[PDB]
Structure formats: structure tokens, C-alpha cells
Amino acid sequence: LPQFEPVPPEHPHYEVARMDLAHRTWGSQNSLVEMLFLRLSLPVQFTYYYSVRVFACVWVGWVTPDYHQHDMNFDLSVTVTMGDEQGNVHSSLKCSNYMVWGSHTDLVIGCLVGLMTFTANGKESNTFFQVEPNTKLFPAVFVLPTHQNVIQFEAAMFLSERKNPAPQCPPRLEVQMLMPVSWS
Numbered sequence: 344l345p346q347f348e349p350v351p352p353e354h355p356h357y358e359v360a361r362m363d364l365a366h367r368t369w370g371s372q373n374s375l376v377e378m379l380f381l382r383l384s385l386p387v388q389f390t391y392y393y394s395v396r397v398f399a400c401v402w403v404g405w406v407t408p409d410y411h412q413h414d415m416n417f418d419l420s421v422t423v424t425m426g427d428e429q430g431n432v433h434s435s436l437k438c439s440n441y442m443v444w445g446s447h448t449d450l451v452i453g454c455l456v457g458l459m460t461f462t463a464n465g466k467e468s469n470t471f472f473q474v475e476p477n478t479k480l481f482p483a484v485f486v487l488p489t490h491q492n493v494i495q496f497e498a499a500m501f502l503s504e505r506k507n508p509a510p511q512c513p514p515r516l517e518v519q520m521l522m523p524v525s526w527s
Contacts, residue, residue, distance in 0.1 A: 345413040347382045347481075347523030359522055365514045366396070367496040367522070371488040379486035379493065380413065380525040382406060386481040391455035391504045392462075393482050394497035396448055399489035403451040404442035405459065405472065406483040413525055415487075417445060441480060442472040452497075453482075455504060 350357050356373035371379070386408060395403045402417060412419050422438040444451060444461050452462045457476070460469035482501065486494055500514045 344411045345380070345525035345527060346411075347380075347384070348526050349384065349521040349523045357524060361516060361520070363516075365497070365516045366394075367516075368492065369494045370492045371490060375488075377415070377487055378413070378524075379488060380483070381486055381494070382410075382481045382483035382523050382525065383496075384481075384521040384523055385505045385519060386479045387455060387501075387504055388479050389456050389475065389477045390499055391501045392498045393453035393455070393501055395451045395484055396495040397451075397489075398448055398493065398495065399491040400445055400487070401449070401451075401494060402443040402445060402485040403453075404444060404461075404483065404485075405453060405480045406442070407440045408479055408481065409440075410525075413527060418443065437474055437476065439472050443485065444468070444471065454498065455501070 350359050352359065355375050356371055357379065358370045358372060360368040362368055421440060423436040425433050425436040427433055442453070442459065442461070444463065450464050452465070454460055454462065458473050460467075460473055461471055462468060484494065499510065499512045502514055502516060503509050503511055506517070
């Protein structure tokens with residue numbers, strides 16, 4: 344199982360670089376071409392935008408706590424539809440378990456609560472995994488590197504949401520927001 348563990352420098356080379364607007368610079372400098380399933384360590388619980396800024400095809404999104412699909416494949420996994428004795432339906436019952444979207448700096452941004460939507464390059468691109476109950480999701484981003492400083496991260500701030508001091512609206516990333524890869 345590919346459970347996440349935080350990137351621990353020295354590493355063959357995924358250079359974390361938390362910095363201060365607050366954001367997170369990156370870079371696979373060394374000749375290691377593949378697999379950067381960059382889940383963030385601090386999942387939401389159910390307003391809160393989530394910017395990402397690729398510097399150089401990246402599957403930005405959100406992820407349910409379980410997830411062991413460590414594969415080269417883009418776009419993989421479940422719609423539910425509770426029925427009736429009538430043979431009809433109590434129609435739909437949520438879906439999916441999660442969010443993802445496939446020179447210049449691409450800038451992808453999410454949002455948060457019961458709904459969530461992508462907003463690529465400051466422009467709307469809504470609906471992809473836009474309903475859930477009172478559940479949880481990591482602010483994850485899957486990546487295959489371009490080498491050239493591969494990726495960067497960031498309505499009220501997400502930091503207000505992850506942690507107890509809600510509101511306190513302005514950003515402060517704070518130390519715990521580590522950036523695990525899904526190790527083999």
C-alpha cells in the first residue's frame with residue numbers, strides 16, 4: 344500500500360521548499376523522471392481556495408484519505424444510487440472517492456464548503472467532484488516532473504480551515520504542513 348510519508352531530505356531528490364504571499368517551491372533537480380503523488384499532510388473536514396502554480400501536464404486536485412493507486416495511469420477511480428422497492432429510485436447517492444484536472448505558468452485553484460469546484464488560471468472550470476457529506480480530503484496533487492522547478496502551492500484561506508483557529512483569515516502556513524509522496 345502507498346501510504347503517504349513526508350518527503351525527508353536528503354532524498355534522491357524532491358526538494359521541498361516552504362516559503363513566504365505564502366507558498367511552496369519545488370524541484371526534482373536530479374535525473375529521476377517519475378511518480379510525484381504530492382498529497383498534502385493536512386486534510387480538510389467539512390469558502391477556502393487552494394491555489395497551485397505549475398512552472399512547466401499536472402493533475403491538480405483533492406483526495407480522500409484512502410488511496411493506493413500508485414500507477415503511471417491518469418484518471419482512475421464510484422457513483423452510488425440507492426434504490427426503492429418500487430423498482431424506481433431514491434435518486435442518486437453521492438459519487439466518487441477523487442478530484443483531478445489535466446510554455447507558461449498554469450495556475451489551478453479549488454474551493455471548499457457541501458460543494459467544491461476547480462477554477463483554472465483564475466477562470467471557472469466548475470464541477471468534477473462537487474458533493475460530499477461531512478467527510479475529508481487531502482489537498483493533494485499528482486505530478487510527473489518537467490525538471491524545471493516542478494510545482495507550487497498556496498474567500499478565506501485554507502489555513503483557517505485545517506486548523507482550530509478559525510477564522511483568523513489571513514494566511515500562515517505553519518510548520519506542520521508537510522508534503523508526503525506516496526511511497527511504494
